[PDB]
Design a binder for this molecule. Structure first.
Ligand SMILES: Cc1cccc(C)c1OCC(=O)N[C@@H](Cc1ccccc1)[C@@H](O)C[C@H](Cc1ccccc1)NC(=O)[C@H](C(C)C)N1CCCNC1=O
Lengths: 100, 100
């Protein structure tokens, strides 16, 4: 699809059998999911800095993400973010471009 | 142009005779420039919340922004952001779409 930006660019994603909406975010290097997201297995501590300051997150490697049905695999961060965010690490795998 | 997302999507912008680079950010509702940015005239207090928390900003209305040479006019926030960010309020005016 081609998506205009008059509204926030949310899409439905399925991760580890769970459904959620996440923002397609060209300003994000990394993908981050909300605190209540349950991913199994080991993780590594990471800190993410946005506008406002920094927050501690859990880094999960090799997570399968189904983004508008497209299947991709990458690193997913989990922490106390206000919204689920799909960052460039996954946007590149769905062939996402900015056009104008 | 069409821009891929293997790298951060920075573009050059000119605002109030000053040049800077700014991130094209679909995850941002609003446009925010770094604390050292000098805009003339009246402004209104606003607070922006990102990942990490919130920060106090100045809201300037009807600012002319030249984005990749395109001319657009909109609200611009100025505060202690780590990077200049072009949000959807301006991205819509340059006909910016996400494609995949
Ligand atoms: C949502 C919003 C509403 C009104 C006004 C503004 C400016 C708004 O956006 C603020 C905002 O932080 N949006 C983020 C996503 C957002 C949407 C909704 C709520 C909260 C946040 C994101 O798009 C931009 C922001 C840019 C940035 C900040 C600091 C250093 C470098 C880059 N990017 C990041 O925080 C990313 C994260 C998300 C992986 N990030 C973290 C560090 C390393 N690099 C990097 O890419």
């Amino acid at each position: 699809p081609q998506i205009t930006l008059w509204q926030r660019p949310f899409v439905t994603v399925k991760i580890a059998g769970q459904l959620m909406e996440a923002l397609l975010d060209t300003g994000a290097d990394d993908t981050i999911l909300e605190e209540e997201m349950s991913l199994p297995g080991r993780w590594t501590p990471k800190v993410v800095g946005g506008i406002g300051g920094f927050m501690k997150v859990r880094q999960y490697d090799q997570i399968l993400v189904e983004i508008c049905g497209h299947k991709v695999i990458g690193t997913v961060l989990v922490g106390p973010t206000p919204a689920n965010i799909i960052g460039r690490n996954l946007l590149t795998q769905i062939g996402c471009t900015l056009n104008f």
